[PDB]
Symmetry: C3
Subunit: 141 residues, 3 copies
């Protein structure tokens, strides 16, 4: 089975064996989450979301409609994803994070992005363009 913390609001039944979902998470009904994932505290996971096996999602991550996380991905704490490039209140793009990629803490991913297999995104990076497989990308400070 899977472990849902009593202080989480998990509405999806589509959750693989060995997955842990921690305190103060929200997971909406259509979310798909694979086996042996760790969804740490304070995450939000929307409906049109697929998360593979052995994925680590650290605290404070929201994964929106139209985002796919492949197997073995690491998402650092407070990583931010997006699906609307020109948002206006009361007015979409797909992101895919490919197998084994790692996204550094508090990075910001623009809409429509592909991050290639085994890529490494630096902490605090802003990713405005696709990142090739196995590439280390970080923003200049």
């Amino acid at each position: 089975g899977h472990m849902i913390h009593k202080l989480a609001d998990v509405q999806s039944k589509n959750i693989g064996s060995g997955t842990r979902i921690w305190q103060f998470c929200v997971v909406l009904p259509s979310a798909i989450i694979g086996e042996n994932c760790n969804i740490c505290s304070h995450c939000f996971i929307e409906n049109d979301v697929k998360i593979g096996n052995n994925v680590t999602i650290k605290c404070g991550v929201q994964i929106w409609d139209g985002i796919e996380i492949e197997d073995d991905v690491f998402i650092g704490p407070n990583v931010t994803f997006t699906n609307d490039k020109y948002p206006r209140s009361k007015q979409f793009s797909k992101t895919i994070i490919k197998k084994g990629a790692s996204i550094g803490a508090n990075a910001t991913i623009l809409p429509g992005i592909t991050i290639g297999e085994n890529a490494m995104i630096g902490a605090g990076a802003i990713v405005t363009k696709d990142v090739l497989p196995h590439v280390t990308y970080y923003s200049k400070i």
Copy 2:
């Protein structure tokens, strides 16, 4: 009426019709929130706070004392606001986000800032100076 999720702690009665406040939000007693707002999960809204009508506040946003959000504003997830330029533990400035402006995901807004009507702030930007009406501003990476 307005919708307050059972898993939110909303202490303000000053909430307009059609407003939704989602899981794991905190709203302190003096907050004013207009009609048809969406306050997404994991937000914090302090006392000396005015939020207009048709405002979208995505997940993970804290709005501190001395901050005003006008009508039709979009606040991206994990946008950070501030009200003390030189903070020291155990030792204020006003921000106003003007009508229809949009703040990109995980942007950081310094104290005392005005963001003009219909401005667009890039995801992950650091806003250290006012942004003129209708201007698109983003930080160099």
Copy 3:
């Protein structure tokens, strides 16, 4: 005594007099927190964590295993800490924030960092190298 909000999950008994821990915090059993701290809403505090006296931790902060916060430190909202420089899912470094230092809102601190006494880190900064005592550091935009 100390104040633990009913909507927090605090598992540590090692909490000093006058400390407040607010809604939707998680504090794991071995955490040590001194006197007169303010742990604001939506924080996560792991096991191998020592926090001194008179520390302010604003909303949305996670403090991981191997991180020490000295007395009189200010941590801005959504400040991100790290303890693994090359994270890969299903595969550590110490940080110390020295007495009286202040970390600006939504800053990102890489692993193994020392921030010196009374330093000031700008909002949204990425700290990839130690910051000397009493130095103001911010990232170029």
